[PDB]
């Protein structure tokens with residue numbers, strides 16, 4: 161801990177306040193987060209989960225009951241990037257690239273049976289080189305929460321990350337959150353008002369979901385042409401497949417990387433204001 165020099169607070173977090181700090185020894189600029197034997201074993205495992213599209217968990221410093229997560233440092237997050245683009249919007253090639261990289265990150269994690277669980281634009285860090293990385297692998301915002309989690313499912317799968325990335329994908333195209341709920345029922349209902357109240361037809365087993373209510377209003381689905389305009393048919397197809405109620409039928413990241421949409425994928429660089 162005495163190996164670091166906090167240069168300034170750069171954000172916070174459901175766990176802790178993240179600082180920017182240079183390694184007094186190596187000069188290495190990092191993102192210093194200041195946050196249970198299992199909550200140490202688990203977080204140290206991630207240390208071995210290295211992929212280009214996953215922010216690097218350089219180290220973990222549990223000192224004097226104070227936990228510190230020394231992370232690699234990226235200058236900007238997606239939320240502030242999307243904010244800095246609300247007027248023009250992020251170009252489609254950058255949107256495509258990003259989705260593609262995150263999906264490669266997710267594919268890597270998912271292959272290792274590790275889920276993020278809390279995918280948000282603020283956990284997606286970008287750099288001037290054009291990459292995007294999955295920060296803070298999730299150990300107060302429901303906008304991007306998959307419906308199985310809202311319906312009380314306790315053993316939700318990797319498919320939840322996909323739904324979030326779907327919602328995030330939509331938000332980058334639309335410059336507006338897809339399902340901004342202020343409560344869990346409002347979150348669920350907004351999803352309902354768009355994708356149609358789920359039922360045994362489109363989602364076998366939904367009716368047995370812990371928090372499922374036979375009394376849920378019955379909203380009819382709406383076309384994605386109205387959901388994510390002006391996203392082309394390729395993207396809307398991928399989105400709908402990422403936003404499928406039935407988790408089992410929800411497309412995987414691995415499969416998503418092979419969607420015709422990613423045919424013309426490139427690696428454009430953003431124009432960061434640092």
Ligand SMILES: C[C@@]1(O)/C(=C2/C(=O)Nc3ccc(S(=O)(=O)N4CCC(O)CC4)cc32)Nc2ccccc21
Nearest residue numbers: 171172173191231233234235236237282283295296
């Ligand atoms: C997200 C971050 O705080 C940040 C971090 C970084 O470079 N590596 C990190 C690794 C993890 C997290 S976090 O996803 O654990 N976290 C804290 C910030 C919050 O808004 C979301 C959750 C923050 C950062 N750099 C910058 C720079 C400008 C905006 C936000 C940030």
